[PDB]
Amino acid sequence: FKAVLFDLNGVITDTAEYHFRAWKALAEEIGINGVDRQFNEQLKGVSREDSLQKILDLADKKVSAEEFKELAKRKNDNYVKMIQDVSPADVYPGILQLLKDLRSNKIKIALASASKNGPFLLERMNLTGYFDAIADPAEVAASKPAPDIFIAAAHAVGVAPSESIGLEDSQAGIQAIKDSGALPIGVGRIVIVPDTSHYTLEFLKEVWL
Ligand SMILES: O=P(O)(O)OC[C@H]1O[C@@H](OP(=O)(O)O)[C@H](O)[C@@H](O)[C@@H]1O
Ligand SMILES: [Mg+2]
């Protein structure tokens, strides 16, 4: 194995709560009831545009293509203010060490997140240096569960998805990894780890075989 493709939220850190808060604020702003925690599970690793459609689907309010755009920027502007306080403190357990062990063992590291804020978040956590590249969700043809972002992360570091491990916390993201041809190891409640402190290189390798 040659590369590890990282989900961001759920793996490196998680800004899920800020994400939900900003979508809540938006839904309340547009009078669209019932965007709750239970609903927000449905939003993990989905792009901003996809997340909004699912919110908009609730009230079956069509908002012809320019409006839809704007509401996304509103939600983004809020969410961006909320994550100004991210720091190296929000690094998930065992992730720094893993990054370190990866790079020292000559395994490429790429970000395969659905989030356009991935680079900002990575910079705040002082993690930029570890990443050999970042899949641009702007360039990518479809969000998780499509494989496109994982294919793009692998390509960025000069590897096939088939020479890669993908690390994920949502089912759509697992599905995206599986279908890229890379190897999923998830974290949450078919290899599954209870938490990111079990994501050590020794484990990752032992799973490869
Ligand atoms: O461009 P944005 O609005 O910042 O990000 C889009 C999405 O990024 C995803 O990050 P990930 O794929 O888990 O690392 C989040 O899980 C998802 O809840 C969010 O809608
Ligand atoms: Mg995620």
Side-chain angles (χ1 to χ4, degrees), residues 7-10 44-45 144 168-170:
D7 185 35
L8 165 89
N9 288 297
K44 310 310 204 35
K144 310 165 177 183
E168 262 293 343
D169 69 325
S170 82

Side-chain angles (χ1 to χ4, degrees), residues 33-123:
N33 197 308
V35 178
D36 72 353
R37 275 144 222 303
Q38 190 251 277
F39 176 88
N40 197 71
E41 285 309 271
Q42 278 219 285
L43 265 50
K44 310 310 204 35
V46 180
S47 66
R48 192 182 314 179
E49 270 92 1
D50 267 15
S51 318
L52 177 58
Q53 207 46 55
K54 305 219 279 254
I55 300 161
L56 284 165
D57 282 316
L58 281 348
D60 216 2
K61 178 93 210 301
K62 293 312 295 306
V63 285
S64 221
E66 207 180 320
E67 330 194 3
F68 185 99
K69 279 200 83 44
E70 185 60 338
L71 309 171
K73 211 192 132 288
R74 189 122 229 54
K75 140 92 189 24
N76 197 50
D77 296 333
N78 198 352
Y79 165 84
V80 177
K81 262 137 96 100
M82 296 175 90
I83 70 165
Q84 290 283 80
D85 359 82
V86 171
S87 72
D90 301 301
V91 186
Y92 265 21
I95 289 287
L96 191 42
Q97 195 53 53
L98 178 67
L99 295 189
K100 282 174 176 172
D101 279 340
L102 283 175
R103 172 190 59 174
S104 89
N105 287 266
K106 298 297 222 213
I107 303 178
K108 300 307 197 90
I109 300 153
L111 195 77
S113 164
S115 192
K116 293 159 152 99
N117 295 288
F120 169 104
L121 280 163
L122 281 194
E123 193 237 6

